[PDB]
Design a binder for this molecule. Sequence first.
Ligand SMILES: N[C@@H](CCC(=O)N[C@@H](CS)C(=O)NCC(=O)O)C(=O)O
Ligand SMILES: N[C@@H](CCC(=O)N[C@@H](CS)C(=O)NCC(=O)O)C(=O)O
Lengths: 204, 203
Amino acid sequence: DHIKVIYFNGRGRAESIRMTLVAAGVNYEDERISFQDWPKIKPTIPGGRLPAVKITDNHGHVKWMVESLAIARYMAKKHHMMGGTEEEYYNVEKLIGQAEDLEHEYYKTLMKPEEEKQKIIKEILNGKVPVLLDIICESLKASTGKLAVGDKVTLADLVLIAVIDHVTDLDKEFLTGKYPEIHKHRENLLASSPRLAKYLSDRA
Amino acid sequence: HIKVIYFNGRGRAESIRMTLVAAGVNYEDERISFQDWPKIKPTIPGGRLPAVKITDNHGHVKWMVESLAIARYMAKKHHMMGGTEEEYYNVEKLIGQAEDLEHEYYKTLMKPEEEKQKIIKEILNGKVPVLLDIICESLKASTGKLAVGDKVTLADLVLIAVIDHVTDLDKEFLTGKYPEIHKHRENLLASSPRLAKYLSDRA
Ligand SMILES: N[C@@H](CCC(=O)N[C@@H](CS)C(=O)NCC(=O)O)C(=O)O
Ligand SMILES: N[C@@H](CCC(=O)N[C@@H](CS)C(=O)NCC(=O)O)C(=O)O
């Protein structure tokens, strides 16, 4: 099976799919679509929206998968990253749901002129952003291990690092000297997964 | 003992109420008024509703928060998150399509009856028919008569909740259009007499 990840932004919705495969040691091909070629590639993608993943087997037959975090939960489930008990599965989904609520505040600043972006940025940062960072911080304090859920990598860890990178894109000092548990989660995750540290280091 | 703690009657907790109804699992509804939220807020872990408080035989309490993480945990416990990895992907796919449509609906909420009208006319000419077409195509790919296969999943219950929100915005919006969505609802209510009874009684 040849796996191609089709997307437009480098650290958008497809990052959860790339990090789940990286952590699993699963190889894939990146295919980035420019704004310029989207009008003619759109009708070719089932449902007309990115990211999408095209899986071509040895005989050339193609399977398509859409909806970014439904693709990431399927890949994570196949590689034992959706928890190891039903209880662990609830805690993985709990943090995923918390991170996605923070990502939704970040999306409100996107593809806007650089004056309205500034206005929306100062509202969320004094708004729902610190509220949701505190809820995620408390969730991390409840884990029975050093990562988000227990002590082994799950999809919850990778969605969290992706969303925290979006917050620091809005204001790079936002977390300086605050939310130690978030900071610590990142150090712990990169130590549990050499592949992800290599991926991230290298992406930087 | 399971208590579902919430404020709106057909808001985020509906996914949790319908998973329990479909599973034949009894629970208690505890609706919080706008007037009592200031003092009950500090008592709920995370400070946000809906929440589910589970009190066992000896009085010990477990809390669960984040609506669709509670609903996928109950659905998983009752065979409603698909029967193969492939069905689970398709369950999650439709869930993610429905939540994108619910996000358009949330943009109209708790607004003065003026700008609510303004936001309604933009989404209904916007992302709302785009996402209803994508859901309609997803239902046509199912290997059975419901959203995923032929037995109830969480994907079916999130879809009826979100479709009820669209008709709240414009009651004629699906009249004479999207036959697969209409058909899905008829099929689901015949597959789960408990849910037909719940909705009927709710109505
Ligand atoms: N909830 C879906 C959202 C897919 C989506 O909204 N994609 C947008 C950008 S990430 C898109 O393709 N826009 C272009 C178009 O559809 O013409 C997911 O997470 O995959
Ligand atoms: N993503 C969370 C959202 C929880 C949330 O946003 N709750 C809102 C209303 S549904 C709330 O409790 N607002 C009141 C407050 O926290 O003071 C879920 O689906 O459970």
